[PDB]
C-alpha cells in the first residue's frame, strides 16, 4: 500500500477506549484466583518440565472494530491511523496491602510480604496482530497443548530460530516466557516494554492522566488499521505473591487504552 | 458538558489558593496517640477470614476549596469558571524520618539505632474541578472491609481485576482505602492526577523537596480543570513506608501534603 | 516591597563563597567525633524517649554580610542584592571510600569494615532572610534537649501538620532535622533544594563537579533579595550512618561549599 | 581516505537487518544448553585458574555484505556505504519471566525457582571494519583455553593497561568479554555502545520497543564507512546467571537484532 | 592574565590522547596484584588505625607537554593551549564479568565466585595546572604512611573542613582518595567530574561508548588554559572490592583513557 497524505476536515479524528484484563493463568472471572496464576509448579530436572497452563502468564489482546470508512473502487482509500495513546495500569494501589494472607515480613506479629519479584510490562497498538518471535529458557520443556507454543522444539529455540514465529491473534493463549515482539517485523505496530527481573525486587509503577505516547514513525505515519480493526495488546506482570506455605502466584493488573485515530489516504492496491 | 471558550484577560483574572492535607493512615483523629500512622497491621488468618481494622487501612485525603463567586447573572450568554493552571506541591516533614532513636526494631543488636520507616510507598496528588473518579480493584475479593468505610459492594473474584461496575467518587476524607480504589483513567477529564508507587517490605523511601518546581495542569488543548460550582478539589495520599515496632508489629506512616494552585478565569458558553 | 528592574552597569555583579561545617551532634572542632553524632541513644518505649543533644543532627546556617548598597535610605528607589545563581558542592565525599576505619566487619574478622551507609539527607538553601521552617516529628512524646530549638508543648497533632509549629532557621547547630523542615507555605524569598533516601543500609550516592550551576530566579525572573544586605546560606548533608564494633552507631555529615553570584536589583522604597 | 559529500538521488539509501545469536560458551545450536555457558568452573587459587572454553562468554560478530557501488576503480571519486542509523533490540527478554525452570528454590521446595540474575553486560557496535579491542584481565596468571583468542604471554601489567595488548574482533565466539573490551584509542570507524551492571544476584533490567533509533553519525556528520563494501555488527548480551539445583551456575545470553540504514558517501579515490 | 579571543586559521587545533593506569595500592606493573590494593588491614581501635600504604588507593595524574606556542615572549599578545572538550573512557569494564576468579562462593562450593562489588569512586579532571585538593578524613586519629602525602598534624577539625588542609595533585599514586578531594573553592583553571556510590556489596554500574564528548568550556566560553604549555589529566576509578576465599578484601581499579581537543587562545602578555 502506497501511503498518501492525512485527510483533513470535519469528522477526520476519532477516539476509542478499552481495557484488557490480565491473563495470569486463572483467566476466567469466576476463578477464585482471577488475576493470579495457579501455584507455580516447578520442573524436577532439565528433562522433566511440565508447567500447568494455569501457571503460565499469557498476552492479552483485544480487537476493536472502527467505523467503516470505504463504501472499494475509488482510486484512493481511507484507513484509520493511530496517532497517539494514553495508557494506564489500573489498580496499582491494590498492592499497598500488608494484611493479605501470606508469608510474614518478620515474625508472626508483622505484616505479610507484598507482591514483589519479576515484573514485565508491555503494551502495543497496531493495525494488525502483533508479530511474535519464539525463544524459551529450555527447549526440553513440555508446554500444555492447549496453548500456542513453538512446534518441534530444539536447543536452537533457546536462542534465535528464524522459523519460530507467530501472530498474537488469541487472548490468553500465548505464554510470555515463549513469545516476545519480533523486531524484524511489526512495521504496522508500535510496542513498548520493560522488564526487571529478580526474585524479590520491589515493583515500581507510575499512574497519571497527564502522559501521551505518540505512535507516529520517523515518516510521521502511525499504525494503519487493516479492515478497520485496531489491535491492542498487553501484559502487566507486577510480581509474585507468596503464600504462607511458600507456594507462589504471579500477580497481574489490567491495562487501560485511550487511542486517538485520524483518517489517512492510501492508494488503492 | 459545556462548550469551553477563551481565557478571560484583564486585572484580577488570576487567583491563587494554598492548602495542606493531613494524612489518613488509619489513626485519623489529631488526638490519637499515633495520629499520622495506621494501627498495628492485623493480618488475615486465612483467605476466608480477612478482616482488616479500619484503623489499619490508609485512605485518600480530600479537601474542597470554595473559590470566589464569578457569575452575577446566570442568564447571560457566557459565564466564567475558575481554571486550575498550575500547582506547586510538597510532601512536608520528610526529614522527620531521619530519626534512628525512635522506639522500634534494632538495625543490628541492642546497641544500634532502630530501623527507620521503609517498605512500600504510595504518593499521589490530584487537582480537579470535581471529585476524583475512582475504580475498584482488590488483592482479594473475599476480604471483609469495615462497613463504616466506602468499599466495593458485593465483591466477587472479578474485583481482583477490572470490573466496570466498581466505580466511585472520592467525595469523603479518610473513607476510601487506597488498597481498594485507584484513579479511573477512563474518566477524570476534569481532574489531573499524578501517582507513584514502589513496593516491597524493606525498600528505602526516596523523596525530594523544593520550592523551585511547578506542575502545569493544562491539557493538550491548553485547558486546565474547570471548577464546577466554584469548587476546587485537592486529593492526596503519601504513604512513606512502614514503621516496625520492637514486637515486630507494624504501622503505615504517612506525611501531609501542601498545595499552592494558581487559577485563572475561563469563559464558557452558558448551557 | 514592589520589585523593579535589574540595575545595569559596571560593578553591578558580585560573588561570594563560603562553607558550612556539618552539625551532626559533636559540633565543636575539638570534639573527638567532630562531624559525627554521638552514639545514638535509643528510646526504651514510646513514652520514654530522651535523645541526647549530641545524637541529633541539626541544620547548618551562616549569614554573609554583603557590601552596603544604600548610603541614603530616603531615595524613592533603593537597591537590593539579588542572588542569581549558586555553585554548591558537598566536600570530602571520597573520605567515605575507606574500608579500614574501626567498625563492624563486612564479613568475618579478615574483611574490611562496613562503610558509611543508610539514611541520607541533603539540603541547601539560599535566601535573603532566615529559612522558614515547619515542625513535624515521628513521635510527639519525645522529650528533646531544652538547649535545642524544638516544638513547644507537643501534642499528637505534631506527628502531622500543626499550622502553629513554625520557626526560623536563625541559629547554627540548634534546629534538629528530625523536628524541622522547610515550610513550603512560606519561603517566598528563599530557594531551597532537598533530597532524601531512607533505609538502614542503603548505599549513599553523591556527585561532585565544578561544572554545575543552579539558577535561583523564580518564574518572574527574580532571585532572593537580601534584606539589610544579608545573605542566608543553610544546609544539611547527612551522608549515612557509621556502625561501631559494638554495633553502636553515629550519623556522619559532610561540609558544604557555596559560591553565590549576586546582582543589584532596584526596588521601590516602602 | 578523503571523505567528501553525501551522494543524493533515488536509490541512495539502503537498509539491512540481521540477528546475532549469543556466544555464552555452548555455541553450537546442537548443544543441549545452547545460549548458556557450561557450569562455571572456579579457580582453586591465584596460581591455578583454568576456565573451560565453554564457561567463557565471547563477543558475537557478523559481517554483512553490501551492494557493489563502483563499476570503475580509476574514477577520481568513489562511493562507500555510510551507516547512518540503527534500530537494535535484545530479543526474547520475556523468556526470563519463568519461575518453573529446574533450579534453586526462592524459598523452600513449595516455591518457584530463582530466575536469571546477577552480572549483566550489553554491548552493540556498528562499523565499517572490525571492532578494535584492548586486552585487560582480572588475573594475569589465569590459563585461558588455547583455541580462544586471548592475550599472549600475560604479565601482571595485563591486570591494567598494557598498550601492546590489542586485537581485532574478527572471529565470532572467540574473544572472551573478560579479556577484551572496545579500545577507545582507536575505533574511528566504528560506533560502540556498552552498559555494565555487576553484582552476584542483581535483578536484570531491560527495555524493548520498535520506537527507538540510534544515530551513528560522528560530530562531523559522518557515520561508519564500509571498507570493501562490508558492514561489521558486533554484540554481547549477558542477561545474568542461572543457578542450578546443585548451585552450579550458567551464564545466560540473549540474541540481538540490528536494522541499519546506510547511504552513499562520496570519497576521493585513494 | 587577561583572556582575549580564539585564534582562527589553519593548524589552530590539536588533539592529544593518553591513559592513566589505576593506583590502588599495588602500583608497580611487576606487582602480582597490580591494579588492586593489598588485603585491607582494619584499625585495631579508633586510636590505633595504621593503614598500610599498599592498602590505600591514590589519585592518578599525568602531565602532557604540548607544542610550544610562543617563539617570542616579547609580543603584546601570547598564545595558550585551551582544552575545549574531552572523550574519556573507563577501560576493561568487561574484565569484571568473570565468575571463576579465585574468591568467595556466591552460594556453596559448586557455584561461581562473587565478582567485584561494593563502593565505587570515579573522577576525571582536565586542567591547565595541577588539580587543587581539600583534605578531609573519616578519622583524625588515623596514622597514615609517611611516604604518602596526607594532612600534616591532623586534629579532629580534619574530620570536616579545615581551610588550612590544602594540596596540589602533583604526584601520581601518592595522594589518598580517602584523604583528598577536589577543592571547589579553587580549580578555576581545571574542570573535574566525580561520581560516588558507597555500600559494602553494591552492584557497580558503568557505561562505555565512543559516542559521548564532554565540553570543558566555562560559562564564558573559556576552557582550561595550559600554563607553560602543560596539560594536566587526573583520575581515579575504583570499581569495587574483590573478596578472597579467606574473606580478606582488595580494592579493584581500572585505567582511564582521555582524548582532549585543544585550540589556540590569545591572551594579553603580562
Ligand atoms: C536417578 C538419577 O540419578 N537421574 C539422573 C537425573 O537426576 C539427572 O538430571 C539432572 O539432575 C540434577 C540433580 O541435581 C538436576 O535436577 C538437573 O536439572 C538441572 C539442574 O537443576 O541442574 C535443571 C537446570 O534448569 C539445568 N540448567 C539449565 C541452564 O537448563 C541443569 C543443567 O542441564 C545441568 O546442571 C548441566 O549444567 O540441570 C537434571 O537435569 C540426569 C541428567 O544428568 O541424569 C539422570 O541419570
Ligand atoms: C516494664 C513494662 O512492662 N513496661 C511496659 C512497656 O514496655 C510498654 O512500653 C512499650 O513496650 C513495647 C515492648 O514491646 C515497646 O518497647 C513500645 O515502644 C513502641 C514499640 O516498639 O512498639 C515504640 C514505637 O515507636 C511505637 N510505634 C510508633 C509507630 O510510634 C510503638 C507503639 O506505640 C505501640 O507498639 C502500639 O502500636 O511502641 C513501648 O511503648 C508500656 C506501653 O504498653 O507498658 C508498660 O507496662
Ligand atoms: C587491650 C584493650 O583493652 N584495648 C582497649 C581498646 O579496645 C579500646 O579501643 C576501642 O575498643 C572498642 C571495642 O568495642 C572499639 O574497637 C573502638 O573503636 C571504635 C569502635 O568501633 O567503636 C572505632 C570507630 O571507628 C569509632 N567511631 C567513629 C565514628 O569514629 C568508635 C568511637 O570512637 C567510639 O565507639 C565512641 O562512639 O571507636 C576502640 O577505640 C580503647 C579505648 O576504649 O581502650 C583500650 O585500652
Ligand atoms: C597446597 C598449598 O598449601 N598451597 C599454597 C596455597 O594455599 C596458596 O594459594 C592461595 O590459597 C588461598 C587459600 O585461602 C587462596 O585460595 C588463594 O587464592 C586467592 C584467594 O582467594 O585469596 C585468589 C584471589 O583471586 C586472589 N586475589 C586477587 C585480588 O587476585 C588472592 C590473593 O593473591 C591473595 O589473597 C593475596 O591477597 O588469592 C591462593 O592463591 C599459595 C599462594 O600463597 O601458596 C601455596 O603454597
Ligand atoms: Ca524485516
Ligand atoms: Ca471515557
Ligand atoms: Ca503562603
Ligand atoms: Ca588514537
Ligand atoms: Ca575561591
UniProtKB/TrEMBL annotation, chains C, D, E:
Record's subcellular location: Host nucleus; Virion
UniProt GO MF annotations: metal ion binding; structural molecule activity
Keyword terms: Calcium, Capsid protein, Disulfide bond, Host nucleus, Host-virus interaction, Late protein, Metal-binding, Phosphoprotein, T=7 icosahedral capsid protein, Viral attachment to host cell, Viral penetration into host cytoplasm, Virion, Virus endocytosis by host, Virus entry into host cell
Similarity remark: Belongs to the polyomaviruses coat protein VP1 family.
Subunit architecture: Homomultimer; disulfide-linked. The virus capsid is composed of 72 icosahedral units, each one composed of five disulfide-linked copies of VP1. Interacts with minor capsid proteins VP2 and VP3.
Its job: Forms an icosahedral capsid with a T=7 symmetry.
Protein known as: Capsid protein VP1
Organism per entry: Human polyomavirus 9
Lineage of producing organism: Viruses, Monodnaviria, Shotokuvirae, Cossaviricota, Papovaviricetes
Full-sequence portion shown in this chain: 34 to 303 of 371
Amino acid at each position: 500500500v502506497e501511503v498518501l497524505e492525512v485527510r483533513t476536515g470535519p469528522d477526520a479524528i476519532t477516539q476509542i477506549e478499552a481495557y484488557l484484563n490480565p491473563r495470569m493463568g486463572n483467566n476466567n472471572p469466576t476463578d477464585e484466583l482471577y488475576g493470579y496464576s495457579a501455584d507455580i509448579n516447578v520442573a524436577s530436572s532439565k528433562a522433566s518440565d511440565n508447567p500447568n497452563a494455569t501457571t503460565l502468564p499469557t498476552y492479552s489482546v483485544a480487537v476493536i472494530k472502527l467505523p467503516m470508512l470505504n463504501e472499494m473502487t475509488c482510486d484512493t482509500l481511507l484507513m484509520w491511523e493511530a496517532v497517539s495513546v494514553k495508557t494506564e495500569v489500573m489498580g496499582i494501589s491494590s498492592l499497598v496491602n500488608l494484611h493479605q494472607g501470606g508469608k510474614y515480613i518478620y515474625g508472626s506479629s508483622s505484616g505479610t510480604i507484598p507482591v514483589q519479584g519479576t515484573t514485565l510490562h508491555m503494551f502495543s497498538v497496531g493495525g494488525e496482530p502483533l508479530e511474535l518471535q519464539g525463544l524459551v529458557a529450555s527447549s526440553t520443556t513440555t508446554y500444555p497443548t492447549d496453548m500456542v507454543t513453538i512446534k518441534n522444539m530444539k536447543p536452537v529455540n533457546q536462542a534465535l530460530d528464524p522459523n519460530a514465529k507467530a501472530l498474537l491473534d488469541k487472548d490468553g493463549k500465548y505464554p510470555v516466557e515463549v513469545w516476545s515482539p519480533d523486531p524484524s517485523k511489526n512495521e504496522n505496530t508500535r510496542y513498548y516494554g520493560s522488564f526487571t527481573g529478580g526474585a524479590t525486587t520491589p515493583p515500581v509503577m507510575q499512574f497519571t492522566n497527564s502522559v501521551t505516547t505518540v505512535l507516529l514513525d520517523e515518516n510521521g505515519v502511525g499504525p494503519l488499521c487493516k479492515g478497520d480493526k485496531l489491535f491492542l495488546s498487553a501484559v502487566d506482570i507486577v510480581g509474585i505473591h507468596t503464600n504462607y506455605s511458600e507456594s507462589q502466584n504471579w500477580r497481574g493488573l489490567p491495562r487501560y487504552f485511550n487511542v486517538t485515530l485520524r483518517k489517512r489516504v492510501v492508494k488503492n492496491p
